[PDB]
Design a protein around this ligand. Structure first.
Ligand SMILES: *[C@@H]1O[C@H](CO)[C@@H](O[C@@H]2O[C@H](CO)[C@@H](O[C@@H]3O[C@H](CO[C@H]4O[C@H](CO[C@H]5O[C@H](CO)[C@@H](O)[C@H](O)[C@@H]5O)[C@@H](O)[C@H](O[C@H]5O[C@H](CO)[C@@H](O)[C@H](O)[C@@H]5O[C@H]5O[C@H](CO)[C@@H](O)[C@H](O)[C@@H]5O)[C@@H]4O)[C@@H](O)[C@H](O[C@H]4O[C@H](CO)[C@@H](O)[C@H](O)[C@@H]4O[C@H]4O[C@H](CO)[C@@H](O)[C@H](O)[C@@H]4O)[C@@H]3O)[C@H](O)[C@H]2NC(C)=O)[C@H](O)[C@H]1NC(C)=O
Ligand SMILES: NS(=O)(=O)c1ccc(C(=O)N2C[C@H]3CN(C(=O)OCc4cc(Cl)cc(Cl)c4)C[C@H]3C2)cc1
Ligand SMILES: [Ca+2]
Ligand SMILES: [Ca+2]
Ligand SMILES: [Cl-]
Ligand SMILES: [Cl-]
Ligand SMILES: [Cl-]
Ligand SMILES: [Zn+2]
Length: 806
């Protein structure tokens, strides 16, 4: 109920929300159907339009007008945005030369530069170049301020998950808005686009920027706008708020535009009809900048121009139907479209079987345009599993396609030419970022980055302490002239042991064998040196990784590689080695095929054993440092140490062996040497975070050897590839992956073919940031470089996407 009989007199676009059943006058009252009876009359005036004309200049003030061109309007803060241009001979902001804003130039009483977030729905990254001719205001913001060539949204690349990620710094799995449509099985409630459940606070997790600001004594404009409020009025409302007295004035504001998303759905990302929406958004930006200029704030306010996701070509005819795969289509519920989410129609149906559903959806048609996954098997870079609102069964849909349950859903529910939602590494899904103002840099281009990073920056811009979030604070310091956040490296928690030779061979009863009993003063002293770390500078290029949790581990040195061996997990947490451009690949000699060697530095009790693998019919083993890349026949024996061995399904060994035998050398050749750090990951509860020992669900049969869920590698080289990886003077270049450790290669439909046809493709799909690996291992990399720490943080957030040029 709402007692709409109250009035909005002097309350238009009030900032505090008034509780029911009292009628509201804030920018969201329309969507709640709760506005006072006179809200339209008083607060949504439209008379005489949005622009001053010559004849209106110096007019007598008429409070009925949408905006004013009277002499008192600047004092009232309610002039039309083009007032000084039409009436006072001033220029539009866009026509002014761009001039560096070296310091804030703010009117008296302004305690800090305000922040205005200008958010545009569906603004695809390539619009910035492709539409530059019809967007002069945006092009000026872009060229004069700080811009990225694109900004990566979160998955799924839908509106609500991305807007709320921008506001919180959180992945959707953490903030809880995991789709535009959701079912929460604990609430037994559905969240829908059209409805009033979606406004229940229980759906929205984390802490959005306006709350962060308010808790820390910084006032915030109301971020959401009812669709019926015209853009011109949103802009006028923001400008009016900016004219409030110091103690009442907010420091952070948001504008939202439903365009170009709205038209992009109808006409496709580059339909001829898309030009007009782009022009209109630019016009709105112009109104804001003109308005700021009138208020003498155009060199005071920081403006962020940011989108939520892009837009792809998608038509009705490119739809896959689950009814063409499944017999029991009426036993399931599908969230359809540019992603698929599947769960049982009824919880009382004991014949529903996820395993049989997945199988029926796996590699069934040659040109199949979606791929099914149990959510824990989705690429870890998506961070899309740790939430009960995410259905166990997920469909990753190919770009340009849809999935639906049955054909009748498509024609009885073509009406559209564009859509979005796909994998967030897809080029068409990329969106935009521009920062302009005293706190941003001048005419500066920065590399692409992820939208989860922005919350920290916005907190920096406002002098706020960010709530805990998924950004890496400091990784975007290079966007800022000032207000940088200067983080310190995490303190190492566990210090390593450095064992020497402490065990005789006969003390081991591991069921392992090796033909290594064939054998100086030249090379016996030499190999002693190698075991003490004499080659460590070459193979450990950026310092030992720091272990950020309490554990027991040993640093083990070898000629060709160095490792941090966990006595708890019975295997390395990391193995580090450098492969020069000149390195040669060798084979594993016939007589060494099944060779495994006890490590006399490590107790039998803290070693794996070969008998466990012999007995486990499903599990084999691999090596972290590849025997193929040994520097010499003698050094090769080190690669067969029991302390370099890890459990691997035969199916996975196909992948791993090709990576180690073929791809590492290829990368060294292409990048002028590479440094590789490889290791296991245990994430059985799919939270993106390292498992403790008691969370491990699978062991090698009969043993305490834990089975990794994933294997990672971090591959680093010199950004300037004219310098070898091991002699790099400047910035670094990295690519990483987190490969699922799976007992089949069902994920790869072409796996029956030679590895050269499918393995690298698999790895690219599982590309990762060093930061993702950090979360999953409790390790901290790049501790010892000549680079600034903020630059290293940027490097750790880098994702190698393998997409073509934008
Ligand atoms: C990305 O960044 C985020 C943010 O940093 C990371 O997410 C964090 O990760 C932590 C580890 O998973 C996790 O720690 C939890 O915290 C549990 C309680 O947390 C609740 O309260 C939070 C804070 O309240 C806020 O609000 C008040 C004002 O009202 C403020 O004053 C505060 O300052 C806070 O801002 C709240 O944020 C959190 O929200 C989640 O749950 C809500 C529903 O209740 C959702 O609305 C919301 O969306 C969040 O949901 C996400 O996270 C939950 C997990 O919390 C997850 O289930 C969802 O799927 C979704 O992903 C909460 O309401 C606390 O109970 C935990 O402690 C357990 O574990 C420790 C381990 O040491 C045990 O020692 C301890 O005993 C306890 O175990 C007990 O319970 C177990 C299970 O019942 C049981 O087995 C055991 O026997 C024990 O009984 C733990 O500390 C953070 O909550 C989490 N924060 C957020 C925002 O998600 C994330 O990891 C990052 N991602 C990556 C990859 O890096
Ligand atoms: N993707 S789609 O199906 O085409 C699709 C297309 C359009 C809509 C739609 O009209 N909305 C209108 C609603 C009002 N909103 C708004 O004012 O937000 C401002 C904002 C900025 C920032 Cl920086 C963070 C946050 Cl938290 C919020 C966004 C909602 C969404 C919804 C869906
Ligand atoms: Ca959107
Ligand atoms: Ca985990
Ligand atoms: Cl969705
Ligand atoms: Cl296979
Ligand atoms: Cl542990
Ligand atoms: Zn849309």
């Amino acid at each position: 109920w709402t007692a709409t009989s109250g009035s909005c007199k002097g309350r238009c676009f009030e900032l505090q929300e008034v509780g029911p059943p009292d009628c509201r006058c804030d920018n969201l009252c329309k969507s709640y159907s709760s506005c006072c009876h006179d809200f339209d009359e008083l607060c949504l005036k439209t008379a005489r339009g949005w622009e001053c004309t010559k004849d209106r200049c110096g007019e007598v003030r008429n409070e009925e007008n949408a905006c004013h061109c009277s002499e008192d309007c600047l004092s009232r803060g309610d002039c039309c945005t083009n007032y000084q241009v039409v009436c006072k001979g001033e220029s539009h902001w866009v026509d002014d030369d761009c001039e560096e804003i070296k310091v804030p130039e703010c009117p008296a009483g302004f305690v800090r530069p305000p922040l205005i977030i200008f958010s545009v729905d569906g603004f695809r990254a390539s619009y910035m170049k492709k539409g530059s001719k019809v967007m002069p205001n945006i092009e000026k913001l872009r060229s004069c301020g700080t811009h990225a060539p694109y900004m990566r949204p979160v998955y799924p690349t839908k509106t609500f998950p991305n807007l709320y990620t921008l506001a919180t710094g959180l992945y959707p799995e953490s903030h809880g808005i995991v789709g535009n449509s959701m079912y929460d099985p604990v609430f037994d409630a559905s969240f829908h686009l059209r409805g009033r459940e979606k406004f229940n606070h229980r759906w929205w997790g984390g802490q959005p920027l306006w709350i962060t600001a308010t808790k820390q004594g910084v006032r915030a404009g109301t971020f959401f706008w009812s669709v019926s409020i015209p853009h011109e009025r949103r802009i006028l409302t923001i400008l009016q708020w900016l004219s409030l007295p110091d103690n009442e004035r907010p420091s952070v504001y948001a504008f939202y535009s439903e365009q170009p998303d709205f038209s992009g759905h109808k006409y496709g990302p580059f339909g001829p009809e898309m030009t007009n929406p782009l022009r209109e958004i630019d016009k709105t930006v112009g109104q804001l900048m003109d308005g700021l200029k009138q208020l003498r704030l155009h060199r005071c306010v920081n403006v962020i121009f940011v989108g939520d996701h892009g837009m792809e070509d998608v038509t009705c005819d490119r739809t896959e139907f689950l009814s063409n795969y499944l017999t029991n289509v009426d036993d399931i519920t599908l969230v359809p479209g540019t992603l698929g989410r599947i769960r049982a129609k009824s919880i009382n149906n004991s014949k529903y079987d996820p395993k049989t559903i997945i199988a029926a959806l796996t590699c069934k048609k040659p040109d199949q345009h979606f791929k099914p996954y149990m959510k824990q098997h989705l690429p870890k870079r998506l961070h899309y599993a740790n939430n009960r609102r995410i259905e166990d069964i997920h469909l990753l849909v190919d770009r340009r396609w849809h999935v639906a349950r049955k054909p009748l859903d498509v024609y009885k529910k073509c009406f559209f030419q564009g859509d979005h939602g796909f994998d967030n590494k897809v080029n068409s899904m990329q969106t935009v970022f521009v920062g302009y103002g005293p706190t941003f840099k001048y005419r500066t281009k920065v590399p692409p980055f992820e939208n989860i990073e922005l919350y920290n920056v916005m907190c920096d811009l406002l002098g706020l302490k960010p709530a805990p979030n998924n950004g890496t604070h400091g990784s975007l310091n290079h966007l800022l002239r000032t207000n940088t956040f200067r983080p310190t490296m995490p303190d190492e928690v566990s210090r390593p042991n450095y064992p020497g030779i402490m065990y005789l061979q006969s003390e081991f009863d591991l069921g392992c064998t090796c033909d290594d009993k064939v054998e100086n003063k030249l090379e016996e002293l030499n190999k002693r040196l190698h075991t003490k770390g004499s080659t460590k500078e070459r193979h450990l290029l950026y310092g030992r990784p720091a272990v950020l949790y309490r554990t027991s581990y040993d640093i083990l040195y070898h000629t060709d590689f160095e490792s941090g061996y966990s006595e708890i997990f019975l295997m390395p947490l990391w193995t580090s080695y450098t492969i020069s451009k000149q390195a040669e690949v060798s084979s594993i000699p016939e007589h060494l095929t099944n060779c495994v060697r006890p490590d006399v530095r490590v107790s039998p009790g803290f070693s794996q054993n070969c008998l466990a693998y012999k007995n486990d019919k499903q599990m084999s083993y691999g090596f972290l440092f590849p025997p193929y890349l040994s520097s010499s026949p003698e050094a090769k024996y080190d690669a067969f140490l029991v302390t370099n061995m890890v459990p691997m399904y035969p199916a996975f060994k196909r992948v791993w062996a090709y990576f180690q035998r073929v791809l590492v050398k290829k990368y060294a050749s292409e990048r002028n040497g590479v440094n590789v750090i490889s290791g296991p990951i245990f994430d059985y509860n799919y939270d993106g975070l390292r498992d403790t020992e008691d969370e491990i669900k699978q062991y090698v049969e009969g043993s305490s050897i834990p089975v990794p869920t994933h294997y990672y590698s971090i591959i680093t080289s010199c950004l300037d590839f004219t310098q070898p990886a091991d002699k790099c003077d400047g910035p670094l270049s990295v690519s990483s992956f987190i490969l699922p450790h799976r007992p089949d290669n069902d994920e790869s439909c072409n796996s029956s073919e030679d590895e050269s046809k499918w393995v690298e493709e698999l790895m690219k799909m599982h590309t990762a940031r060093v930061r993702d690996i950090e979360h999953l291992t409790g390790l901290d990399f790049y501790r010892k470089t000549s680079r600034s720490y903020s630059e290293i943080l940027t490097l750790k957030t880098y994702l190698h996407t393998y997409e073509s040029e934008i």
